[PDB]
Amino acid sequence: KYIRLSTLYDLMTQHWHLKTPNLVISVTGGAKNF
Amino acid sequence: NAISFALYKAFSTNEHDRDNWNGQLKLLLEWNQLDLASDEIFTNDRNWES
């Protein structure tokens, strides 16, 4: 599901799927070598 | 583990193999240096493309 970007929560947590009782973030960035 | 560790040091300090990192890999592949190649070649601060 592409969305171009330049609030977000309403159309994506009521019309799409469930809530999120945890939220992990992996910060790597576009490093092609890992 | 002593010859290849010594031969790599005289190769690495020529200051012309930063672009020629591919020479240091075939050197460490001609010998068997896993721990040296995984720490000093494949350590992501150098720019390779895989």
Amino acid at the residue A8? L
Q: What is the CA angle B28-B22-B44, rounded to 5?
A: 90
Please name the residues in contact with B39: beta carbons below 8 A apart, sequence gap of 6 or more.
Answer: none
How many A-B residue pairs are in contact by the CB < 8 A criterion?
8
Give CA–CA dist B27/A23, Å, rounded.
Answer: 45
Write B23-30 long-range contacts (CB < 8 A, 24+).
B28/B4
Q: Smallest CA–CA separation between B36 and chain A, in Å?
A: 17
Structural biology method used:
cryo-EM
Q: What number of H helices and E strands is found in chain B?
A: 3, 0
DSSP state of B27: H
- Cα dihedral sign, A30-A31-A33-A34: negative
Resolution number, Å? 3.6
Of all residues in chain B, the one with the smallest CA distance to A32 is B49
Confirm if B39 and B33 have CB atoms less than 8 A apart: no
**Best of B42, B44, B45, B46 to disrupt the A interface by mutation (most A CBs within 10 Å)?**
B44
